[PDB]
Amino acid sequence: FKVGPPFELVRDYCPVVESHTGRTLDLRIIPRIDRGFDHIDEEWVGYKRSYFTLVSTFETANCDLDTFLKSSFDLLVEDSSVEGRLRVQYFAIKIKAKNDDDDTEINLVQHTPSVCPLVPSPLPKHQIIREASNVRNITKMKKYDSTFYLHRDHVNYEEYGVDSLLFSYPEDSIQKVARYERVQFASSISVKKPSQQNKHFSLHVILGAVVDPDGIPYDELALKNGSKGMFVYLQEMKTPPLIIRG
Numbered sequence: 001f002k003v004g005p006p007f008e009l010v011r012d013y014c015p016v017v018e019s020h021t022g023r024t025l026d027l028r029i030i031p032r033i034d035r036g037f038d039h040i041d042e043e044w045v046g047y048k049r050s051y052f053t054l055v056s057t058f059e060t061a062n063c064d065l066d067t068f069l070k071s072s073f074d075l076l077v078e079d080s081s082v083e084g085r086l087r088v089q090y091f092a093i094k095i096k097a098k099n100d101d102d103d104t105e106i107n108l109v110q111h112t113p114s115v116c117p118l119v120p121s122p123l124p125k126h127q128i129i130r131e132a133s134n135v136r137n138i139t140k141m142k143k144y145d146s147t148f149y150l151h152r153d154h155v156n157y158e159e160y161g162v163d164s165l166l167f168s169y170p171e172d173s174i175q176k177v178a179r180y181e182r183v184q185f186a187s188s189i190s191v192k193k194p195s196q197q198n199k200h201f202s203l204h205v206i207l208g209a210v211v212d213p214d215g216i217p218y219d220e221l222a223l224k225n226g227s228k229g230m231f232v233y234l235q236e237m238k239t240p241p242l243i244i245r246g
Helices: 065-070 126-132
Strands: 008-012 016-018 027-035 044-047 052-060 073-076 085-099 108-110 149-151 173-175 178-185 201-211 218-222 228-238 242-245
Touching: 027 126, 027 201, 027 228, 052 085, 052 201, 073 201, 085 108, 085 178, 085 228, 201 218, 201 242
Parallel strands: 044 242
Antiparallel strands: 008 228, 016 073, 027 052, 052 178, 073 085, 085 201, 108 178, 149 173, 201 228, 218 228
């Protein structure tokens, strides 16, 4: 494990507002790469046969988790789409790899990326990510449970309303930290141009809202009840240019 390529803001997309208070939700993705890249003379270098670890959470400025989970949020589209407000079923994160030059998407292979549902939370320290990674100790894993998950089936249900965000999440076990362990680039990718000069890649992290089937950037998504949902972009961050040794 080691300090990896830093993340920078790429863009903020659709604004999110609470349906009851009209309060705008201020969001901030907090991603970090914990291994897989070396910093050689002002350049980040990765390797084909190697793999990398990327973790991420997101935060909501001045909004405590309890209130957040009890709230209802609407996405605000505008102009062309101008639909108005789309109800958020839940928030999730996804990562992608791109050709930092022509912005072409590079496929990633993970060891089990995917759309990870997530609730606001600070990003755990580097060492904790380790002690929680591949260390399946029953007692130990229970010391990190409150750090990595929110078990909806344990909250006081009488405190939440029918439209509460908590109850629109797909599963009872909800992650607090999106952990992408053992990720590699597809072995089919070309890491050099015909001239033999290195190609440049970039890792992206996108925070988004999953909304019901019914011009804005989003990905089509296979929901939980067989329905076709939409993963609408809220915020995106990326690493600086990366090079991949073959």
